[PDB]
């Protein structure tokens, strides 16, 4: 096998633009950038075979930069995706982010919105799980959901808006999360009951029990499957406990609900916030 370091050195030597008087006699520099990109891709493939995945990613990044200089942006976007795959498999989430961002920018400029949305969602997943940059993850899930909505892909859009609303609610942006849940409801049977519950829970965490009661009434009137659901009864019981200011009754209803339908971590966090708001009002009254 060729040495990837020597391949990269040859790529670097070829990727120098023609300067000065030589520019009058040299044809388009595009072909030189293409050949430098091919040398970088060969180096990247050899590094990938060696499981030196970060060096493969860096070589694909160099290849994509040369492809951009050649004018071959569609190839650059594909090569950025290969760089991303190498960095993600190598545990270098930062360079994976940067690779996906360049790929997404190329795909959106080329009108490949759906493709860019796929990668924007994966970018959101990296921001959420590996980097814990929840704000940018929110922005990524929102924009991906919008791109899927323009593409009439309701299911993918809903997957993104679920992730967005969940993260917004965990970040304390309860009103905006409730608005996204209202969009998810309008766009949408099993998940619908969950959306009504989560909307109401966000509203309770915003100390707006009236909006929660309205959401309950809306859901009970518009979806018969929510009306007779455990989620509706639970949301009602939580609204009642919030209006009475009884944080113990709320904790009882939470335990009762948890015994039949396990509360996931998101619901527990939001329910704890609601309880804390009740206890704070109790303390402010003594």
């Amino acid at each position: 096998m060729s040495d990837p370091v020597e391949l990269l050195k040859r790529a670097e030597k070829k990727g120098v633009p023609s300067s000065g008087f030589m520019k009058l006699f040299s044809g388009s520099d595009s072909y030189k950038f293409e050949e430098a990109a091919d040398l970088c891709v060969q180096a990247a493939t050899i590094y990938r075979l060696r499981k030196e995945l970060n060096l493969a990613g860096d070589s694909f990044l160099k290849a994509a930069d040369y492809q951009k200089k050649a004018g071959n942006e569609d190839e650059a976007g594909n090569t950025y995706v290969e760089a991303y795959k190498c960095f993600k498999s190598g545990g270098n989430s930062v360079n994976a982010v940067d690779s996906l961002e360049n790929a997404i920018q190329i795909f959106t400029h080329r009108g490949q919105f759906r493709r860019g949305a796929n990668f924007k969602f994966e970018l959101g997943e990296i921001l959420e799980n590996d980097l814990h940059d929840y704000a940018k993850a929110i922005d990524c899930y929102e924009l991906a959901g919008e791109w899927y909505a323009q593409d009439q892909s309701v299911a993918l859009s809903n997957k993104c808006f679920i992730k967005c609303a969940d993260l917004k609610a965990l970040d304390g942006q309860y009103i905006e999360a409730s608005d996204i849940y209202s969009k998810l409801i309008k766009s949408s049977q099993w998940s619908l009951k969950d959306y009504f519950l989560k909307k109401g829970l966000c509203q309770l965490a915003a100390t707006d029990a009236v909006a929660a009661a309205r959401t309950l009434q809306e859901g009970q009137s518009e979806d018969p499957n929510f009306a007779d659901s455990r989620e509706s009864n639970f949301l009602k019981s939580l609204i009642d406990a919030v209006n009475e200011g009884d944080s113990e009754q709320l904790s009882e209803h939470c335990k009762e609900f948890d015994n039949f339908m396990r509360l996931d971590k998101w619901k527990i966090t939001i329910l704890n916030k609601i309880k804390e708001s009740i206890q704070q009002q109790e303390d402010d009254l003594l």
């Binding site: 759906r114 593409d151 892909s153 299911a155």
Partner: protein
């Protein structure tokens, strides 16, 4: 018990077919895009053929 099992199997198959409907929608969308790009490809191939022929005549 047999009828309840049958009901459970039918509900599961309904779920699988519903998933499939979403997948075939994604497939139809992909195929519409590929038809557009394959039309582009045919046009470009003809254009390349003609240009190469014109250069062949030029060099001759």
């Amino acid at each position: 018990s047999r009828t309840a099992e049958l009901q459970a199997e039918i509900d599961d198959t309904v779920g699988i077919m519903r998933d499939n409907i979403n997948k075939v929608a994604e497939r139809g969308e992909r195929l519409t895009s590929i038809e557009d790009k394959a039309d582009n490809l045919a046009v470009s191939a003809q254009g390349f053929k003609r240009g190469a022929n014109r250069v062949r005549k030029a060099m001759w």
